């Protein structure tokens, strides 16, 4: 039962039902990446999808943001249990005197919403938004997945090292991870590689700037670079501080059902049922506030576990999953924003074949 036939069997129903123009799949197994490419980057250009095509990975970006944050912890910028206002004096006498940096990163500050209100379109309006925000829940008790929440975490983390987020990401973290095809903004020389997204109206679309977009959803990368980042999260980085940063993202803070929330990555005990993996990625978890089952203290989660993250933009749909103990990772990048349940079912089938 060859890998190639397992991947085809899992992916073809996606390509068919969702009319996906282009998909790049990368599988890491036995210490080597394997690439499976389908379709086109741009319906109005000749270049086919390859493992070098750049896709918008949307909220998978939060795994990079989390790693920048833990890098700042390693470098002494802050501690995860610090109050947010320690690092943002403009938030003195706000909710953020009680919220911790870890709670921002884990969407548990107390009901920060999925998106900023549309009116928040500048740095000053962003600052005012956080100053004015009235919590819905006590700090730490509820998970409400939130771009403003992890966005502020990344912004403040970089500030503790005296740098803008984009600078620290592009000049320190990505180079130390040796990621040469990963961008917050795609440079001119790489534009030939940048796919277009295809919206639910079948129109070609690209992500536009937004408040804390870099932190929450802004990375463009290839399947080759993203599977390299997955590998770093399994067998490590040769940069000592980056390795400490990567390891620290495995810190779990609470659970919701069978899912444990870490920094960026969400994880499950492995073996994991398909039902549990679907539930943890479902709208009931992703787009509703859920009361958490708290941990007494944050806990490093282990190798015998499945780590994952979904992400989407207008016209793009990404999913990444890996099991460190098994040495298997899967990256699926598409230029259609197709259903998360379908991403999960396909990846689950591939994973069950490669880690029975
Ligand atoms: C992430 O890609 N963004 C935030 C949120 N992510 O939740 S998901 O991974 O379950 O899709 C919704 C989609 C997206 C966004 N529109 O900001």
From TrEMBL:
Q: Which organism is it from?
A: Aeromonas enteropelogenes
Q: Does the keyword Signal apply?
A: yes
Which Gene3D superfamilies did the record assign?
DD-peptidase/beta-lactamase superfamily
The name of this protein is Beta-lactamase
Catalytic activity annotation? a beta-lactam + H2O = a substituted beta-amino acid
The UniProt family comment states: Belongs to the class-C beta-lactamase family.
Domain Beta-lactamase-related intervals: 7-352
InterPro entries named among the record's database cross-references: AmpC, AmpC-like, Beta-lactam-related, Beta-lactam/transpept-like, Beta-lactam_class-C_AS, CMY-1/10
State a GO cellular component annotated for this protein.
Answer: outer membrane-bounded periplasmic space
Keyword annotations from UniProtKB, A to Z: Antibiotic resistance, Hydrolase, Signal
Instruction: Report the SUPFAM superfamilies cross-referenced here.
Output: beta-lactamase/transpeptidase-like
One biological process term from GO is:
response to antibiotic
Q: What Pfam families does its record include? A: Beta-lactamase
Q: Does the keyword Transcription regulation apply?
A: no
Query: What EC number(s) does its UniProt record assign?
Result: 3.5.2.6
**GO molecular function annotations of the record:** beta-lactamase activity
Highest taxon of source: Bacteria
